[PDB]
Structure 1
Amino acid sequence: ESNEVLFGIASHFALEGAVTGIEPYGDGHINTTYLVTTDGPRYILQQMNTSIFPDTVNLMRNVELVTSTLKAQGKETLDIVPTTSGATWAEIDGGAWRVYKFIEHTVSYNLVPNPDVFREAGSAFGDFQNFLSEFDASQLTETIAHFHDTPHRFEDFKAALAADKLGRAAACQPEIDFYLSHADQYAVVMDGLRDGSIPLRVTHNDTKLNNILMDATTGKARAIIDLDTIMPGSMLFDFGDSIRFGASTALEDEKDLSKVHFSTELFRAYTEGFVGELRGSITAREAELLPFSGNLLTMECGMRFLADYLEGDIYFATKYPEHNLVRTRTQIKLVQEMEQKASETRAIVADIMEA
């Protein structure tokens, strides 16, 4: 938005400095995020995407519950800065806005630079699952329905494909046919949740690497951010999504596919950290599905990118017309390598489950 509008928004919130600037910030695809600079502290200002999260009240209730519980254990988290009237968010001119304190002395990554960073990510998200187990499912109502229900995502994909609103399907038949041909694989986790062979757990549901902040000195995890999708699911959604984003040798939107590979060493590092924290709760069936959960979440995210391309880019932020096609192509390349390396990942999990 204009500066006039953004500075106006900021005046609704209990900031503790005179604002000097408000500038676009970060690589989130969903909300619209800004860095607020002041004569003292920094803030993150976000316009929440109400097309994706229509029930703002329930969403903020969940975020308040999670963050207040962390605070009450003396654990660093996202610190909501209230409105000047004490509310957790503001509805202003038809938009929903919130502010968080900027988390100082941190670093974050869109791409794993070395195995230790990714091991730490695994530990952080594994620990967060232990934390979340303290809630029962009823305390944290779903903020998005069918969120990691891959068969439901596939129904959405098939509809986007049949409609082919922009005539973009002609240019991406290999990608389309990849997702169509893997239809038989999409129900495995949902079927296990439904029949009780996979435990229903409270999960984070968007565990990509850039949703953790690490300390700039110690390298240890400081805080997990992007708390909007905390809701019931499977452990496998958090593990699989982490592998999807972080076991790649390339960015999610890397144009040069020759740079995109699935790294079994990174898979190992993350699994060491994650299982390291969850060894006392992980079931045999969950352990059996750890490698395939990577395939599943990567395919789910990929099909969502491609569906969005076919629909004219209505869901994910994009920077250029082909951006979602570029994104779906990395996800496909990753799954192709995950398939080829299946025996190796199976062996890695077995080896860690004996440690």
Structure 2
Amino acid sequence: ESNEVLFGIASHFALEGAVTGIEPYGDGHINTTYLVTTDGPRYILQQMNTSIFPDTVNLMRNVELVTSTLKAQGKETLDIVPTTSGATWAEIDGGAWRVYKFIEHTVSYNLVPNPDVFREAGSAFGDFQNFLSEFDASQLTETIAHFHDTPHRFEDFKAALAADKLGRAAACQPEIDFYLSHADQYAVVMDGLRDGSIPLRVTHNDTKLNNILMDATTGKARAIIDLDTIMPGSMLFDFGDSIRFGASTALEDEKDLSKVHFSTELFRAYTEGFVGELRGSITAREAELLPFSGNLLTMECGMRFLADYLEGDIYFATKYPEHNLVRTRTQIKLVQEMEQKASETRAIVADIMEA
């Protein structure tokens, strides 16, 4: 957007300084995020993606509930900056906008630099699961239906495949056939939720590493951010998605596949932190499925990238024509290694569960 428009958006909100700049910020794929610099404090300005989140009112009700509950326990969270009229967000010229205080003195990662960071991530998201269990499902309505319903995601993929809108399928048969051939594996968690053998828990559902901010001095988790997909699910969704993004030795969109590997050391680090917090609640069946949840969420995210590629990149932000194809290829590479290292990851979980 133009500065004129963005500065105009900013004037709707109860900011506490003269705005000097509003610049695109971050590696989030969904909302459109800006850093607001002023003569004092910083802010994050976001245009919410209403094609993905059509029910802005319900989305903001969830964010308000989660954040206000954290605040009421003296816990740092996202601080909504209200409109100058006291609302939690603003509809302006057909767009939905919100502002958060910029969370200061923090660092974040798109790639794990060492095991300690990822262990801390595990601890933080494990703790967040405990926090979220204080809510019952009825308080947090789904912001996106079938969000980690992998069989449903596969129906979406198959439809995108069959339509082949852009004729992109011809260049990615190996990737397509990978997802088609794994179709038998996609229902394991949904089946478990449906018949009661996996508990339905309130979950974050987007636990990739760059949705948590760590303190720049202590290295401890300061705040879990990107609260848009908090809703009922399985613990396995949060665990698996974290492993997907953070147990890789490479970026999500790394072009050079030789750099992309699944790290059992990073798997162990995260699991130690995560299970460490949830040992009192984790069931036998959840523990059994922890390794495979890595596979599952990586395949789900990968199929979604490839579906988006086949549909002309309508869902995820992209920087170049092949971006989603590049992303799907890292996810496949990771799953190939997770399959190969299945016995090691089983052993790692078994080991951590006793200790």
CA distance in 2, matches of 1:15, 1:23: 16
Q: Following TM superposition, by how much is the alpha carbon of 1:91 offset from its aligned partner in structure 2, in angstroms? A: 0.1
Q: Which residue of 1 aligns with 2:334?
A: 334
CA distance in 2, matches of 1:309, 1:71: 40
Q: Deviations over 1:78-134 (max 9, x none)?
A: 000000000000000000000000000000000000000000000000000000000
Instruction: Name the SS of the counterpart of 1:282 in structure 2.
Output: coil
Q: Deviations over 1:289-323 (max 9, x none)?
A: 00000000000000000000000000000000000
CA distance in 1, matches of 2:79, 2:350: 39
Q: Deviations over 1:141-195 (max 9, x none)?
A: 0000000000000000000000000000000000000000000000000000000
Q: Deviations over 1:179-227 (max 9, x none)?
A: 0000000000000000000000000000000000000000000000000
Residues paired across the two proteins, number: 355
CA distance in 2, matches of 1:323, 1:250: 15
Q: Following TM superposition, by how much is the alpha carbon of 1:12 offset from its aligned partner in structure 2, in angstroms? A: 0.1
Q: Following TM superposition, by how much is the alpha carbon of 1:34 offset from its aligned partner in structure 2, in angstroms? A: 0.1
Q: Following TM superposition, by how much is the alpha carbon of 1:262 offset from its aligned partner in structure 2, in angstroms? A: 0.1
Structure 2: give runs of 5+ residues left out of the alignment. Answer: none
CA distance in 2, matches of 1:171, 1:217: 47
Q: Deviations over 1:2-53 (max 9, x none)?
A: 0000000000000000000000000000000000000000000000000000
CA distance in 2, matches of 1:315, 1:180: 21
Q: Which residue of 1 aligns with 2:165?
A: 165
CA distance in 2, matches of 1:218, 1:165: 50
Instruction: Name the SS of the counterpart of 1:16 in structure 2.
Output: coil
CA distance in 2, matches of 1:302, 1:217: 35
Q: Which residue of 2 aligns with 1:51?
A: 51
Instruction: Name the SS of the counterpart of 2:354 in structure 1.
Output: coil
Q: Following TM superposition, by how much is the alpha carbon of 1:344 offset from its aligned partner in structure 2, in angstroms? A: 0.1
CA distance in 2, matches of 1:203, 1:105: 27
Q: Which residue of 2 aligns with 1:83?
A: 83
CA distance in 2, matches of 1:283, 1:71: 30
Q: Which residue of 1 aligns with 2:354?
A: 354
CA distance in 2, matches of 1:105, 1:300: 34
CA distance in 2, matches of 1:320, 1:104: 32
Q: Deviations over 1:239-292 (max 9, x none)?
A: 000000000000000000000000000000000000000000000000000000
Structure 1: give runs of 5+ residues left out of the alignment. Answer: none
CA distance in 2, matches of 1:63, 1:278: 23
Q: How does 1:1-355 map to 2 (within 5 A)?
A: 1-355=1-355
Instruction: Name the SS of the counterpart of 1:84 in structure 2.
Output: coil
Q: CA RMSD in A?
A: 0.1
Instruction: Name the SS of the counterpart of 1:172 in structure 2.
Output: helix
CA distance in 1, matches of 2:217, 2:305: 36
**What is the percentage of aligned positions where both structures have the same residue?**
100
Instruction: Name the SS of the counterpart of 1:353 in structure 2.
Output: helix
Q: Following TM superposition, by how much is the alpha carbon of 1:326 offset from its aligned partner in structure 2, in angstroms? A: 0.1
CA distance in 2, matches of 1:342, 1:26: 34
CA distance in 1, matches of 2:15, 2:214: 25
CA distance in 1, matches of 2:315, 2:276: 35
